[PDB]
Structure formats: C-alpha cells, structure tokens
Design a protein around this nucleic acid. Sequence first.
RNA 1: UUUUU
RNA 2: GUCGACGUACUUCAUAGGAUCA
Lengths: 153, 341, 142, 129
Amino acid sequence: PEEMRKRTTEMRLMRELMFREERKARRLKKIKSKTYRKIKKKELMKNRELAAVSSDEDNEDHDIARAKERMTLKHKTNSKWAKDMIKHGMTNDAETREEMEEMLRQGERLKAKNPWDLLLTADDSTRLKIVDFKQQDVIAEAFAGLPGWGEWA
Amino acid sequence: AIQLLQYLGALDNKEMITEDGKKMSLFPLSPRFSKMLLVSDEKACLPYIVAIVSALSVGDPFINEFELRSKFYKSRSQFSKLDKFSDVFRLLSVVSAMDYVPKEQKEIFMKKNFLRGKLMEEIVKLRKQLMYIIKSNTSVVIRNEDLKSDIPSVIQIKLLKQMICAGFVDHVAVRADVLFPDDAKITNRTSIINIPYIPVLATRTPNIEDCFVYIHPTSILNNLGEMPPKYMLYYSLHLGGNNKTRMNTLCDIASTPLANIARKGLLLTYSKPLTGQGLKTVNLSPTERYCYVVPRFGSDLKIGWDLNPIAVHQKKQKGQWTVIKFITRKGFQTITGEEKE
Amino acid sequence: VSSALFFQYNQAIKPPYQVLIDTNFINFSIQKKVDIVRGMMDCLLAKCNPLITDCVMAELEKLGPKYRIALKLARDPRIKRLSCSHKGTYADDCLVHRVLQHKCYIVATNDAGLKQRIRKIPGIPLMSVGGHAYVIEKLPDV
Amino acid sequence: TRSSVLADALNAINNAEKTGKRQVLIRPSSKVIIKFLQVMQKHGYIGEFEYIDDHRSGKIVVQLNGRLNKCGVISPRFNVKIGDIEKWTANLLPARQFGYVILTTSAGIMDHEEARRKHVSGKILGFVY
RNA sequence: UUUUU
RNA sequence: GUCGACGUACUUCAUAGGAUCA
Ligand SMILES: [Zn+2]
C-alpha cells in the first residue's frame, strides 16, 4: 500500500531531527570556556528554580544530607584542592577565592538545620448557556449615512 | 475602548462583536463585569461573582479612615478573614454576611460595621436583578434565601480569583523589584504602602520611576505585615496628594493561572523551547512536541515581562508551533519516562 | 558551678576514662587505620570505656551501605550503648547536653563547630584524630 | 599485557559487588585464584563458585552474597617474616580483627591468623575484609 | 463632585 | 660604565564571604 510511503517519511523526519540535535550537541561539547559554561549554568538554575522543577526536601532528606556532611566533612579547607590553593597564595586572586567560597557556603547550607492548581477551563463548554436580529440590521442599513499550486493562477 | 473590548474578548481583531460580546450586552453592567459572569458558572461560583460584581457595580460600601479607631478595625478584621490578599473578597464577605442578617437587625449591622447603609440596598436589589436575568435566560421567581450562600471552598477561592482576572486581565501589575531590581531596591524596613509596582501595558518612560505605582492606604496589604504578592490586580488609579500614582487592589494572582487566562487573549506570547537538564523537548512526532517555554505577558514601547516557565503541548499547525494545552510538572515528567521506555 | 571543677581543672575525670564517640570520629579512625580501643589506650595511656549514644547511632544507620564498616565497628560489643531521653535525633546537641549535665566524659570528635562549642564549656577534655593517631586537648594528666 | 590474573579476578569480584550483581564471571582461572577463593569461602565472604573448563586456562563463575566489603592484591608479592606480619595487618586492614591478610607460605595459601597458628611465613598474596 | 439602564 | 644575560638573596600587590540589626 501507499501507507508504507508515509512510514518512510516520518522515519526520515525522526532521523534528520536527531541529526540536527547531534550537530548542535557536538558544537556545544567543544566549547569549554569557563565564562560560557558559567553563564549557561546560572540561566539553567534560574529556570529550574522559577519552574520549581526540583521537589522540596522533606525533613528526612535534610537530616540524611546533614548526616553525611558531618560524617565526611568534605566541604572544608582540609580537602586537597582547597589546601593546595590556600597554601601557595593562589586564593589571593578573586576568582579562585570565589570558587573556594562557593564550595564553603554550599557546605554551610548542608550544615543548616453567621458563618461569614485547578486552572479554569474558560472555553465555551464552561459558560452558562444563556439564551436570548437581521431585521434590526436592515434598520441600521435604513440609516445608510490551494489555488494554483500546480496550475496557472 | 475598542482595545478594552478586544482584551475582554467582546470584539475580535476585526472590531466585530463576538458571541461573547453579544452575551455581555444582555447584562446592564460594564464589559468588565459582564466577562466575570461569563466565567462564573463553574463549580457553583455564580452567587459569589454576582455578589462581587454587584458590590463593584454599585461602588464601595466601606467607609474609609480619612472620612472618619478600634471598632473600625475589628469590623474589617471580620471581613478580611476569607483571604488576606483580596480586597474584592472583603466586599464579598460583607455582601454574603448581610444575607444572613435579619431584616430588623440590618440597620444595626450596617452602622455597627461602618457600612453605607444605602449602597448595600442597591447591591441586594442589583443582586436580585442579576439573579433574575441569569435564571430567566438560562431556563422565574426569586426569594431572599436564594441570596444566602455558604462560605466558598479553598478550591472555589482559587477559581474565583482567576474568574475575576478574566474581567481584569488588562489590569495586572507586577512588583517593580522583580523587573528592575536596580531601580526598585526593596528593604525589609520599607513600608508596604511604599513598595513600587508597575502596571501591564504602562507606557515606557525614560525614567522608569514615572511608571511606579503604590498601594492604596485603605487596602489590607498595608496591614499585611509581610512582603506583598508578586502580581496584583487593580481596579482604578488615583493620584495621591504626594503626586504618587495610587492603585486600588482587587486581588493577587499566581503566575501559572495568569498565563492560562491570558492564553485566550492577545496578551500572551511564548518564547522558544528551553533546553537543559530536566527541561527537554520530548518529540512525539514531526508535528507534536512537549516542551517548556517562558510565557511573556503584555502585547518595545510598553512594559511586558516574562512569567514562570510552564510545560506546554505544542503542535505544528500550518508550520507554526501552537500551544494546545498546559501540562503539570508530573504529567511532563511522566511523558518523558513514557518516551524513554 | 560543678563541684568537680577547680578553676579550669576538672578534678573528677580520672582513669578509667569515659569517652563519647562522635559519628565523624569513626571514619577518621578508619581513614587512618586506627583501631578505636587501642588508639585511645595509646593516646591517653589509660583504659577507656567507649560510649556511643542513640542519636549518633541513629545517624550511623541513616548513612547507608557506604558506611557499613563504621556501623559494624560501632556495634562492637566493647562499645557500650547510651540511652537518649530526648526527641531530637541530632548528635551534636545531644552530646553537649550530656557533658553539660555531668562532668565525666571525653568528647571524641573532629567537627570544628562542635569542638569550638565544647571548648567554651570548662572542664571537658576534647579528643580528636589527626595525622597518624588520636590527640587529647584539655587533659592535664598526660 | 596481562600481568596478574589474581588482581584481575579480585577487581572483577569487587566491581560485581559494587553493582549488586549476585554472580560474577572471572577469566582466566588459576590454581592461586582457586585457593584464594577457597580461603574467602571458608571465612564466608563469598558463596559457591564453579570452574568451567575449556581446554584453556579456564573460567570461573562466583556466586556473590553481599558479605564482601573489599578484596585486593598486594603486588609485588613481598617477602614477609612473622615479625613483619603484624605490620601488614596494621597497614592493610581497618581494624585488628576486620578481615584477614592472605599469605602464600611454604605450607600453602592461607589467612594470616592460620599462618601464626602454624608458625610459618612467606610471601603476601592479598587481603580480604 | 456627579451619575446610569 | 649608575651596561646586558644568568645565578643567588630578599621586598611587594593581589582576602574577604553569608545571616541579622540601624
Ligand atoms: Zn540522644
């Protein structure tokens, strides 16, 4: 049947669609600029926070997270990278100091302990079906005052 | 005026009266009030909107502080119980409460609550008349206990707010710090009455401070004690004695409901699909996709702003991506898994 | 003021010593391959009766499979169990409440915040693990 | 190139326990591998295992039961005296009776305590705990 | 200030 | 010669961050 041709078309659309994302994903992978990634991360966080995509952490989730942090102390300057930066006057620079900071605050966050949404469907189905013209329009009158796709058109 | 009727859906883009427009003309009310009735029948919310609409139609029965202290606030404390961010619901509380007052004690109640006794009478009379046209044109003898109605449910409270936004879609204002944090620096010491707001479709001036709007003294939000809501509906603007534009609050609206209400209007535009972790374009078909977008509310000479991202169902109709439906976060997450399996 | 304290000297804590184990202490013992019982006997040259409370134990059970080693070491029969009579499952608050109540315990921990808050309390020997073995801070008998 | 079959086998077992796999395939087999697994099995860290013959070095299939915390090989196989055995136990084991240190001594492959009981010593094969 | 089906 | 390169020895500049309060 000719329905087989339709199946070929939609598969073709899928494959090329994958190709476009592949090329776009490839190009982004090559760009490894610190600032470029830094801009992208901030924007992503803003959208996720704005959309509230991330579920709230119950008291249990906080307790387990705090337990692990206290258990390891992974977010203090005794870590390798922090110690190496500190001991060699590398953190005098602002940018590395921010990164060391950004680590530290994240650890601190984990350490913290008469009687007097359902979106409305305002389509016509939910309107009160109220019930009550041309001759009145005669009175207003009484006032006075795809073609050519394949052929020549 | 033609724009206003267009925003409310009365007129199409050709200035031609819509089926909604013809229905509004059957009411004696302003176009704004008629539209709220066009959305009020859902979940037996009709008496509440009638009470609100009648109260707004006849004017405020409340006596203001300037026109006149302890007995003043206890009365208001009673009628602001339904919601802490809704002046309109203060009107509803009074009107509905009046229905349960015996005829003999009514005059005592109105005086005791600093209520303009007459205006209440027209509201009840107008509440009866609107009740009559509705039942007469939907199917009529109306008796006084028909006006008696019980407290709205929390769901109904949410529906009523959006319902009102339909009649006041064009009168949404956003806190200035959200749009221009540099220009609008809010501190914890800042009085609520002095928190700037910006209305939608306000003419962009060289100085954005010129577009700032501030809350009325009469509003409960001055006594709220915490930060006001992000978005606010207003009825009218008044010029304060200090040359400060002053707004009469109606009620607050959340971001996602606002987008839904503006969707059927011309206020809402959709950005391109977002990308990143969590947010990804699930492609059902060459003509179908599910994705997150950033709705923009408002109409580069007017002040519009972007709303919270929302999951939407998009279809490629005539080569353009058209939003069919909104989707909850759970539904979108389930969709993503359904594609993976 | 506790009668067991002479100015800043605690004249009650004598051998054999009673020592409270903090959760983080166990790992730093494990990271350094320091046996808990012998490690303390070595630092203090005394018999030490290790004590582990419910809250710290509850913390340990919460940790998960990754810290199973600490857990079984925690359940060693030589380790005595302390009952907790307070709702909160936090460990740091529980420990300091105990040392405040009675002045006989050594606190074994490496958490800087808890160490600082113990340091404020007088007459509380503070013990830690660093380098290669345990170290005792405020204990004159050494 | 492949230097130590024992290290390969132990790493495969450890990863199989990482992923929760109840059973693991080891290639190639050897006598030392079998003896090491027999010690592990006597101490109960691993369950049954199978030797599959292919007229070559062969294969092994070990059942894994979730009581193995870690297994490793000490390469090079240092010579160990009875004086130095306690040093190795202190270095390679978290505690004094957490696991065993396996030695290939002149009387065979066995854990450290058995070597002490027999009063023997030799080269060090690895550790299990 | 007014004011309307 | 107030010379160049290198070696050696020293000096110096880049440290504040979050919360609350006025
Ligand atoms: Zn406790």
